[PDB]
């Protein structure tokens, strides 16, 4: 009996109990299974049903379609590349040397070109799950340590942080690098400021930026976006820049990447970003429930479209990125993932309705700007969001000052 079991060991953790130091863990475990059972002490004697637990669990569930399609796509890409490169005894030797491959084959899968969706998803899982487990455990350690030392209750949000961080990295990232990235993102960007609801930066993107600038050779280039040993192949944004729509060819299969391929998600890249359709399906829910800001999403879209069309109109004879239209910007890279799930973090965005529009417009402008006129990087969503996080409070200030003037004029 879980209920009475939890209610019997409760006394060991209250002040003076033999396990007082583990009160944070006890509370976190107990309120996950059962509700607090508390009443209202004053003020409004009736409260809304919503709470931070549900707010975070909905976002955590919204990315499951993207995660599953990402696993399937990663497996399919890896198998296609392996069969493009090797064959026969050479392929058998390659399989025997990688634990991902021979585990996939041990569990009933097949690494041949006629593999099914089950085998492809299993191969994708043997890449995704280790990263996610490492991130979860390492970040939870730091969160619980801070809560214990400061004698607080563990707030919610890490479920979202960990899964997003695991979904925005290449399938080949080393586990020690993943651990370092999550450590940085959690400790430096979130916990030092007091924890959930008290930071100003996006933790997952902060960790990703740490990795990006510390170990650039493992999170960029041709060697990291497809989990096939010895395979080297560029991706869509890198191909468009060298350049034009005629350079989009999937070398592993010899076909030409189409807008539908990019929209559905049959392209290499970060694990969860590929499927714009799945991302839209997931984001529509949380937007309907009112947990995500349609104002921020609209601002991002407006900025992207405006700047893309300006570049298209003015044109260039050297830079091929001037040709890319808005509907290609939408489906290439990590634009949709960031726009839907990372640009809508309530704590990092603006706190005013009119400031949210400016925040989104700035993010959208910066993403396209970095994509086009910055030759160092092919994509700019993470940098753009991190940049707009710095100026969101300034938009809030600009709006509130006008409000204060209205008040002083005795009309507000």
């Amino acid at each position: 009996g879980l209920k009475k079991f939890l209610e019997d060991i409760e006394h060991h953790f209250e002040p003076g109990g033999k396990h007082e130091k583990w009160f944070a863990l006890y509370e976190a475990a107990a309120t996950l299974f059962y509700t607090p059972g508390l009443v209202t002490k004053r003020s409004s004697h009736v409260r809304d049903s919503v709470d931070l637990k549900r707010i975070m669990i909905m976002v955590w569930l919204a990315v499951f379609p993207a995660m599953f399609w990402g696993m399937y796509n990663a497996g399919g890409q890896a198998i296609a590349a392996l069969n493009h490169l090797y064959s026969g005894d050479q392929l058998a030797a390659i399989v025997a040397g990688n634990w991902h491959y021979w585990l996939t084959e041990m569990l009933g899968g097949t690494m041949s070109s006629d593999a099914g969706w089950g085998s492809k998803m299993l191969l994708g899982a043997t890449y995704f799950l280790p990263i996610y487990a490492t991130v979860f455990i390492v970040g939870g350690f730091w969160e619980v340590l801070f809560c214990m030392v400061r004698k607080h209750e563990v707030n919610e949000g890490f479920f979202v942080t960990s899964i997003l961080f695991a979904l925005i990295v290449p399938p080949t990232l080393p586990l020690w690098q993943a651990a370092l990235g999550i450590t940085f993102g959690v400790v430096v960007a979130k916990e030092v400021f007091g924890g959930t609801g008290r930071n100003f930066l996006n933790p997952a993107l902060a960790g990703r930026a740490f990795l990006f600038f510390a170990y650039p050779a493992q999170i960029s280039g041709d060697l990291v976006w497809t989990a096939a040993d010895g395979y080297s192949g560029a991706t869509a944004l890198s191909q468009w820049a060298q350049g034009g729509a005629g350079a989009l060819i999937n070398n592993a299969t010899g076909q030409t990447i189409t807008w539908m391929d990019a929209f559905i998600g049959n392209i290499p890249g970060s694990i969860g970003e590929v499927s714009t359709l799945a991302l839209m399906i997931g984001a529509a829910f949380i937007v309907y429930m009112g947990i995500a800001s349609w104002r921020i999403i609209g601002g991002v879209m407006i900025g992207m479209i405006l700047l893309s069309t300006l570049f298209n109109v003015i044109g260039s004879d050297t830079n091929a990125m001037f040709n890319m239209p808005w509907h290609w910007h939408l489906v290439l890279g990590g634009f949709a993932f960031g726009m839907f799930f990372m640009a809508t973090d309530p704590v990092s965005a603006s706190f005013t309705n009119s400031g949210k529009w400016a925040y989104g417009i700035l993010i959208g402008v910066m993403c396209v700007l970095i994509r086009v006129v910055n030759p160092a990087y092919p994509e700019g969503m993470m940098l753009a969001i991190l940049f707009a996080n710095l100026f969101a409070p300034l938009f809030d200030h600009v709006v509130v000052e006008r409000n204060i003037k209205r008040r002083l004029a005795r009309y507000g």
């Binding site: 309120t31 059962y34 003020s43 409260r47 809304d48 309907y288 509130v400």
Partner: protein
């Protein structure tokens, strides 16, 4: 005509039938000392003392000249005191009908009486405490005046009584009270109401204004925001319709009028309805044999801004016109935070409940969650119709930045104005207490 678009009409069950009926016999009444903000009492009575209706019980130290008087004739039986000897209640046991008497006038002299005479008559009878001052919601000082007197002739609180039903029984008294206020004020009197008709005063400086929309439309704070913005320099007074009827009766017959009409309603009330009671009536005796079995909470006022009426506080408040009863919710459910709630209310669309329009909920006193930090998913903007930045203001209140809160507009607010923000907070903050603390700091420092 002003239309409020942002707000919330709480769909709680047990809505009263708007028909008046007699109430159960009341044998004890009391004055609650903690509901008058900034009051430091000076006792003029002692346990066992006999009192007459309208006789002074205590006088405020910090507001010289303000008298709090007995609603009924009887004798003092209890003077409850709490931590640090704070006064909680002065309880009087009803007996006899002796009373203090004052002057009376004809209906056509009230509009031209003298302001100082009006002030003296109001103060002596203890009816001067029906007024409150925005900012700080204190009883006005005797020597002060105001350009704006706001009358609240509408009620939008959940399970509240309909003012027109009550007023139609006391048209002459209501009009006489309006006439008295027209002379008591140095500016205009604002009568805030709904679209329906009410008795009218013929004085030029008394004017009616119509408000429409969900709950927050019926608050004196909203009315002030829209008709006469308040600040440190500009101060407005507020009074509700039943107190206006009391004022009219006072100046028409020379006797303090202490009758009330309150709504007794809630999910656990067997037959919700309007009930005739007396000021400061004992709620324990009032709700006797009116509620279903089980553990319940009795509240004086709305479930949004009432006061838990237990122990020495089990009496009707001075500024409250309803009594609410609902179950104490203490159940613990497996994975309750994750279930699809067909029977769960929320201002968001995360539960199945919002799909069943017209549904009414048997709400309880559970806090649907634990205390947490504030994550602004934008619920406050949906319930605050005033021209402010609710998220910034609430974070200023949480941080204790009184100076910034004043700029953001804290002086315009009362604890009743943040009830919905407290209602819809995912972090389970309670913003009325924080606002009161900030106002206390601001008032003390200057």
């Amino acid at each position: 005509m002003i239309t409020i678009k942002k707000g919330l009409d709480l769909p709680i069950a047990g809505t009263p039938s708007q028909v008046i009926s007699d109430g159960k016999a009341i044998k004890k009444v009391a004055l609650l000392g903690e509901e008058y903000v900034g009051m430091r009492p000076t006792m003029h009575v002692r346990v066992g003392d006999e009192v007459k209706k309208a006789q002074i019980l205590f006088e405020d130290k910090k507001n010289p000249g303000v008298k709090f008087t007995s609603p009924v004739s009887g004798k003092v039986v209890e003077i409850n005191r709490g931590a640090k000897r704070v006064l909680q209640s002065v309880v009087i046991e009803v007996a006899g009908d002796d009373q203090v008497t004052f002057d009376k006038f004809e209906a056509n002299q009230l509009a031209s009486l003298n302001r100082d005479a009006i002030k003296t008559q109001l103060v002596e009878s203890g009816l001067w405490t029906a007024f409150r001052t925005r900012p700080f919601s204190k009883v006005p000082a005797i020597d002060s005046t105001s350009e704006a007197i706001f009358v609240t002739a509408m009620d939008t609180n959940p399970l509240a009584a309909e003012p027109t039903v009550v007023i139609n029984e006391q048209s002459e008294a209501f009009v006489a009270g309006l006439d008295v206020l027209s002379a008591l004020t140095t500016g205009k009197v604002y009568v805030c109401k709904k679209g329906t008709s009410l008795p009218r005063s013929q004085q030029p400086n008394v004017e009616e204004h119509v408000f429409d929309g969900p709950h927050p439309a019926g608050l004196a704070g909203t009315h002030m925001h829209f008709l006469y913005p308040v600040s440190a320099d500009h101060v407005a007074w507020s009074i509700n319709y039943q107190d206006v009827i009391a004022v009219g009766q006072l100046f028409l017959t020379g006797e303090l009028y202490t009758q009330r009409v309150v709504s007794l309603a809630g999910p656990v009330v067997n037959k919700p309805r309007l009930v005739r009671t007396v000021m400061g009536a004992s709620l324990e005796q009032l709700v006797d044999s009116e509620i279903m079995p089980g553990e319940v909470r009795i509240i004086s006022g709305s479930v949004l801004s009432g006061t838990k009426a237990t122990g020495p506080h089990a009496y009707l408040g001075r500024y409250h016109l309803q009594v609410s009863v609902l179950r104490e919710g203490r159940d613990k459910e497996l994975f309750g935070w994750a279930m699809p709630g067909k029977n769960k209310f929320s201002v968001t669309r995360s539960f199945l409940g919002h799909l069943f329009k017209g549904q009414v909920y048997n709400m309880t006193t559970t806090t649907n969650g634990s205390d947490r930090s504030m994550v602004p998913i934008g619920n406050y903007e949906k319930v605050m119709p005033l021209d402010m930045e609710p998220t910034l203001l609430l974070r200023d209140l949480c941080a204790g930045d009184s100076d910034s809160a004043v700029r953001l507009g804290a002086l315009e607010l009362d604890e009743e104005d943040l009830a919905l923000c407290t209602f819809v907070c995912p972090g389970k903050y309670e913003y009325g207490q924080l606002l009161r603390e900030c106002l206390d700091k601001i008032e003390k420092e200057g």
